[PDB]
């Protein structure tokens, strides 16, 4: 089986007050490869605020942290299930504030290949 | 729902030629927490070899890297569905080699809480 890798931008410049997207995609599509979960983290947050977004192929989205929080986050293209489509894990952040800045990591938990991640610096 | 984290040993001394176990548990138990995948990684390896083992609740184990490889790795207690039990992700390496030494990370991809990981240094 072909290996998969995460494609993200190394830096995204966001406009304060507005909306910004953090593109994230798993490539290439590979037969026999399942995406079990997608997660976004802010690795520089305190541990209980590091997981900021997760998307499960049956259960859909969860935004477990207050920062940036549920009301301002969305998965632009992730679809629950026959076959769920999680290869585009692009995240959007509305009402962008200075407190939203910093590193974000997009990770795909896949089987059988395991977990793969990419990192983006959101600069404001 | 309580916050979770990963319990591992900081360091493990292993018997060259023999078997070593790297314990890993997700704690505390929390009802309604779904464990989507467990993975073990060697973050210092080249990315084709970083993911060394994975366990999916329906699909069972996989050993994506040829090194250590499936012939030498097993999950000691993880069980696949019926109810999967992935909260104990303890990994056994068999026929331990010098090339196996280094940093190991055990990660749980969970929903709704996201991903959490603990690290163990394997030495001789």
UniProtKB/Swiss-Prot annotation, chains A, B:
Glycans are attached at residue 103. The keyword Signal applies. GO terms for molecular function: cell adhesion molecule binding; coreceptor activity; identical protein binding; protein homodimerization activity; receptor ligand activity; virus receptor activity. GO terms for cellular component: apical junction complex; cell surface; cell-cell contact zone; cell-cell junction; extracellular exosome; focal adhesion; membrane; plasma membrane. Keywords: Cell adhesion, Cell membrane, Disulfide bond, Glycoprotein, Host cell receptor for virus entry, Host-virus interaction, Immunoglobulin domain, Membrane, Phosphoprotein, Receptor, Repeat, Signal, Transmembrane, Transmembrane helix. Changing residue 59 to F: Loss of entry of HHV-1/Rid1 and HSV-2. No effect on PRV entry. Disulfide bonds join 24-106. Residues 2-122 form the Ig-like V-type domain. Ubiquitous. Belongs to the nectin family. This is Nectin-2. It comes from Homo sapiens.
């Amino acid at each position: 089986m072909q290996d998969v890798r995460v494609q993200v931008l190394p830096e995204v410049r966001g406009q304060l007050g507005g909306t910004v997207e953090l593109p994230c995609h798993l490539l290439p599509p590979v037969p026999g490869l399942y995406i079990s979960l997608v997660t976004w983290q802010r690795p520089d947050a305190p541990a209980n605020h590091q997981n900021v977004a997760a998307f499960h192929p049956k259960m859909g989205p969860s935004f477990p942290s207050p920062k940036p929080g549920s009301e301002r986050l969305s998965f632009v293209s992730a679809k629950q299930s026959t076959e769920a489509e999680l290869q585009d894990a692009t995240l959007a952040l509305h009402g962008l504030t200075v407190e939203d800045e910093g590193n974000y990591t997009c990770e795909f938990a896949t089987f059988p290949k395991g977990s793969v991640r990419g990192m983006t610096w959101l600069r404001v």
